From Swiss-Prot:
Domain TSP type-1 span(s) in chain numbering: 1-58
Descriptive protein name: Complement component C6
Noted disease: Complement component 6 deficiency: A rare defect of the complement classical pathway associated with susceptibility to severe recurrent infections, predominantly by Neisseria gonorrhoeae or Neisseria meningitidis.
Family, similarity comment: Belongs to the complement C6/C7/C8/C9 family.
Gene name of the encoded protein: C6
Subunit structure: Component of the membrane attack complex (MAC), composed of complement C5b, C6, C7, C8A, C8B, C8G and multiple copies of the pore-forming subunit C9.
Cellular compartments annotated: Secreted; Target cell membrane
Length: 61
């Protein structure tokens, strides 16, 4: 199975604008002949969540 046959969406915009939140992207899966036959379901990545707007949030006086 070539999982890149099913394209990544774009990464989402960040859950926060600082103090570090998360964001995600997922393959655009369609459950066809190729998917069921080549066991893409067992070995292919479906989700990613991660660090975005990482820096410590600034604090004003
Ligand atoms: C997003 O952009 C940055 C430039 C900051 O100005 C952020 O301010 C912070 O906003 C968060 C919202 O999650 C508040 O919790 C913070 O108190 C505030 O400093 C801005 O939201
Ligand atoms: C998601 O990004 C990967 C690289 O990690 C590509 O192989 C894939 O085609 C999709 O764009
Ligand atoms: C997710 O976001 C990264 C930027 O950090 C892109 O380069 C990638 O193509 C995908 O859109």
């Amino acid at each position: 199975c070539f999982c890149d046959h099913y394209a990544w969406t774009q990464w989402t915009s960040c859950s926060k604008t600082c103090n570090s939140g998360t964001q995600s992207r997922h393959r655009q899966i369609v459950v066809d002949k190729y998917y069921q036959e080549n066991f893409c379901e067992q070995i292919c990545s479906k989700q990613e969540t991660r660090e975005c707007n990482w820096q410590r949030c600034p604090i004003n006086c």
